[PDB]
Each structure stands twice: as structure tokens, then as C-alpha cells.
Amino acid sequence: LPEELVLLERTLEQIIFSSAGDVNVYDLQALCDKVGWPRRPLTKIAASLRNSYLVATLHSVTKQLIGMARATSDHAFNATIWDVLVDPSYQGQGLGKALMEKVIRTLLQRDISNITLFADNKVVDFYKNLGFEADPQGIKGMFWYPRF
Amino acid sequence: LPEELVLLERTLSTEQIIFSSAGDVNVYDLQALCDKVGWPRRPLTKIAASLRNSYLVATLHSVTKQLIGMARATSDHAFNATIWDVLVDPSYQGQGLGKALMEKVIRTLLQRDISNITLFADNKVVDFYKNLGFEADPQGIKGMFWYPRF
Numbered sequence A: 001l002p003e004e005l006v007l008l009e010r011t012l013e014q015i016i017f018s019s020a021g022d023v024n025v026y027d028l029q030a031l032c033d034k035v036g037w038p039r040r041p042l043t044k045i046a047a048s049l050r051n052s053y054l055v056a057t058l059h060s061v062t063k064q065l066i067g068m069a070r071a072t073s074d075h076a077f078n079a080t081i082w083d084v085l086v087d088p089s090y091q092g093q094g095l096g097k098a099l100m101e102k103v104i105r106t107l108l109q110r111d112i113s114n115i116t117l118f119a120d121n122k123v124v125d126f127y128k129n130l131g132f133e134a135d136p137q138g139i140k141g142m143f144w145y146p147r148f
Numbered sequence B: 001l002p003e004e005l006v007l008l009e010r011t012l013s014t015e016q017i018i019f020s021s022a023g024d025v026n027v028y029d030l031q032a033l034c035d036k037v038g039w040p041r042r043p044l045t046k047i048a049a050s051l052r053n054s055y056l057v058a059t060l061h062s063v064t065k066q067l068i069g070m071a072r073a074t075s076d077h078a079f080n081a082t083i084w085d086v087l088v089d090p091s092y093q094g095q096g097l098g099k100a101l102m103e104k105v106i107r108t109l110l111q112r113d114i115s116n117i118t119l120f121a122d123n124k125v126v127d128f129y130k131n132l133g134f135e136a137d138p139q140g141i142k143g144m145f146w147y148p149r150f
């Protein structure tokens, strides 16, 4: 599956998917600010990105970063998906689903068979719709003294 | 907390249980250890790849040198780690060793400044992790798998 794909063209702009890991940490910070996520040191955001097995992006080209998902992984059995995000201006258009499909497909192409995530209650059904299953066989996602 | 650690010294003949986060596991011993606890044979090439790309590989060894325990974690090196493949040789279970292994793993991840330490727990070991300070579904967060076949 190619690194870059055009997911959509509309008249007014195209929406570009990429798995090359092309994220500017200021862009990602500004996007994270829109959904009100608290800021974290740019250098730590940068470190988290280059130590992610998969960094996937949505861009708006007329490049504007409008979405992103990333995954840690051991490159053999497991990947865990983090920081899934779509610009609120671009939500409700199917782009978040389209991002996650290409993410899942890229991981399966790389022979990662155990694809996991920790879903906020608000977005559980979004992932179920994509085929994720909570607590299969009673397995529990657990956190060491979380600060949530 | 150092790289390598005598957790315990005992007699029956003198045995030491040694902790290490160096990550120098012999993949063939790890393969037999995986087999001993009843996990299916995985290809050597994929197990080794999983070791090399694990941010943390922690072992327990018996020196009288035998691998008797292992735990590993993936990480993004900054914010998140997920712990996988915690196992203790059945002949060494029920001795506090799994607890001691996990405590050293948690401390190592904390020393590396990882805030979010996570894992997915089989329902029959959920209480084992609760006893170490893990919490299931905080704020209703759910761990999810894509079309799992367990």
C-alpha cells in the first residue's frame, strides 16, 4: 500500500493520507490545542514521534495538518494506537474513520496481528464501529496509578 | 536502581535469583521458557524482532544460569509504555518472583520518566496486577482489540 494516498477531492482541496511520519511538532501542538489537550514539551512530543512505529497523517492541500494517529509496536506481535486526532473543523466527514482504516491496514500489511488501543468512554463506539472489541474474554486494560 | 540485581539468595546448594534490565536474553532459552508455561511456538525471527524493538526487556535468572522469568515493554520513550509477555517458569511461581520482577519493571519505567504505564491483563491475572497498583478501566477507559481471536 503506497505511502501517500489521496482520500478525497472536493471543489472549493484534497485530503491526503500519509504513513511517512511527516509531522511538524508545532503543527501537532496547534491541532492538540484545538481539542484543548494540555501542552507537553515540544522535545518530548518529538521523541514520542520518532519512537512511534507508525505515524499516520491527514493533510489538507489546496499542506495543513488536519489529522493524525500513531502507534507504538514491537515490530512483530503488538501495536498500540495513541493520539488519534482530527481537527474539529474536519470532524463529522468520515476522515477519522478513513484515517483509522489506513492505520489498521498498514499494521496488518506489516504482519502485526494484535492491534490494540485505550479508548476514552466518549469514543468507545467509534472504535467498535471500526471493529475494535472491548474486554475480549474479560481482558482488562490497566494503568499504574493514573492521573486522569 | 541498577541494571543488574541480586533479588534473593537461598539454599537447598546455593541459588541466587538475579534481575536484569540489560536485555541480553538468549532467544533460545526464552523460546523454551515460553514453551514451558504453555504458550504456542512462535517463529524465532519474530520473537527476536520483538525483543530488539522492546524498549525494556527485563529478566530473572537462576544462578547455582537459567532464565526463569521475563517481562518486556513497548514505549514511545516519552509518554507511554505498554508491558507485554510477563511470565515466570512454573517451577518458580508462587515465590514472590513475578511481583519482584514487575516492581523492578515499574521502577525502571518510572526512572526513564514514563508517565503512562499500561498493559492488557487476562481476567485470571487481573488481581495480580491490581495488587501492584494497576487500575482497570480508570474513568471508564476501555482497552480494545481489533477483531481479536482469543
Ligand SMILES: CC(=O)SCCNC(=O)CCNC(=O)[C@H](O)C(C)(C)COP(=O)(O)OP(=O)(O)OC[C@H]1O[C@@H](n2cnc3c(N)ncnc32)[C@H](O)[C@@H]1OP(=O)(O)O
Pocket (backbone or CB within 6 Å): A035, A081, A082, A083, A084, A085, A086, A087, A090, A091, A092, A093, A094, A095, A096, A097, A098, A117, A118, A119, A120, A122, A123, A124, A125, A126, A127, A129
Ligand atoms: C487515541 C485513542 O486511543 S482514544 C481516541 C482519541 N479521540 C479523541 O478523544 C480526540 C477527539 N476526537 C476526534 O478527534 C474525532 O472526533 C474522532 C477522531 C474521535 C472521530 O473522528 P471524526 O472525523 O469525527 O469521525 P468520522 O466522521 O470519521 O466518524 C465516522 C463514523 O464514526 C461515527 N462516530 C464518530 N464519532 C463517534 C463517537 N464519538 N462515538 C461513536 N461513533 C462515532 C460516525 O457516526 C460515523 O459512522 P458511520 O461509519 O456509520 O458513518
Ligand SMILES: CC(=O)SCCNC(=O)CCNC(=O)[C@H](O)C(C)(C)COP(=O)(O)OP(=O)(O)OC[C@H]1O[C@@H](n2cnc3c(N)ncnc32)[C@H](O)[C@@H]1OP(=O)(O)O
Pocket (backbone or CB within 6 Å): B037, B083, B084, B085, B086, B087, B088, B089, B092, B093, B094, B095, B096, B097, B098, B099, B100, B119, B120, B121, B122, B124, B125, B126, B127, B128, B131
Ligand atoms: C503477560 C501479560 O501481559 S498479562 C500476564 C499473563 N500471564 C499469564 O497468564 C502467564 C502465566 N503466569 C505467570 O507466569 C505467573 O503466574 C505470574 C506472572 C502471573 C505471576 O507470577 P508468580 O510468580 O506466580 O507470582 P508471585 O508469586 O510473585 O505472586 C505475587 C502476588 O500476587 C498474587 N498472585 C499471584 N498470581 C495471582 C493470580 N493469578 N491472581 C491473583 N493474584 C495472584 C500472589 O498470591 C502474591 O500475593 P501475596 O504477595 O499477597 O502473597
